[PDB]
Paper text:
Consistent with its absence from primate mt tRNAAla sequences, the human mt AlaRS/tRNAAla system was recently shown to be insensitive to a G3:U70 identity element. For the human mt AlaRS/tRNAAla system we show that loss of the G3:U70 identity element was accompanied by a radical reorganization of the recognition mechanism, away from sequence-specific direct readout in the acceptor stem to sequence-unspecific structural readout of the flexible tRNA elbow. The appended C-Ala domain, which plays an auxiliary role in prokaryotic AlaRSs and is dispensable for aminoacylation in the human cytoplasmic AlaRS system, plays a central role as a folding aid for the intrinsically flexible mt tRNA elbow. Fine-tuned induced-fit adaptation selects mt tRNAAla and rejects non-cognate mt tRNAs.
The model suggested two major contact sites between mt C-Ala and mt tRNAAla. The second is formed by helices α2 and α3 of the N-terminal subdomain (aa 783–872). Both helices are lined with highly conserved basic side chains that form an extended patch of positive surface charges. Due to the 3-helix architecture, helices α2 and α3 can move significantly closer to the tRNA than in the prokaryotic complex, allowing direct contacts with the T-stem and V-loop. In particular, the mt AlaRS-specific Gly825 appears to be important for tight association between C-Ala and tRNA and may explain the sensitivity to V-loop size (see above).
Residue numbers in the entry: 811 to 988
Write the structure that this text describes.
Amino acid sequence: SRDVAEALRLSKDIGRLIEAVETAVMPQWQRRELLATVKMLQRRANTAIRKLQMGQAAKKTQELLERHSKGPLIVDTVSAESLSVLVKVVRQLCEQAPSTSVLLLSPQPMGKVLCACQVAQGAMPTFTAEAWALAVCSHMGGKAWGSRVVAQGTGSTTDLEAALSIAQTYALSQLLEH
């Protein structure tokens, strides 16, 4: 968590350095030389950040797998620092569980909650992820956006159990048809 934040901060500081070099007073050839080195640093930093996130997403999906069976549906709570990380967890879980539909909520301080969901390919085209996240998040007073296969949303509540119960009812209503 903190390690990821520091990594992110490092990148931001670097980004700040590129702008300082771009707007700096110096000969242009010199500017070009320093900018090339700085951009490369930025790339390394960005990759490091990506590696850290991907890894912590991997930790989570695995913990989740212990918690659940590779069933038709996974509805659960995970701690996620960012929406991007949570979305990654959903994608990995769905890579590892090809026949499962997934919706996850991550509690945030200030009573803010994020949602990401994905629908398995095997599942019927009628079942859509956007409406799934919209029912869950709209119950939490937020909003949702996405496509038929995947969607994301945000809401604000401390009653997570109610939202999870709606998430499962909505899914099972679509999954158990015929």
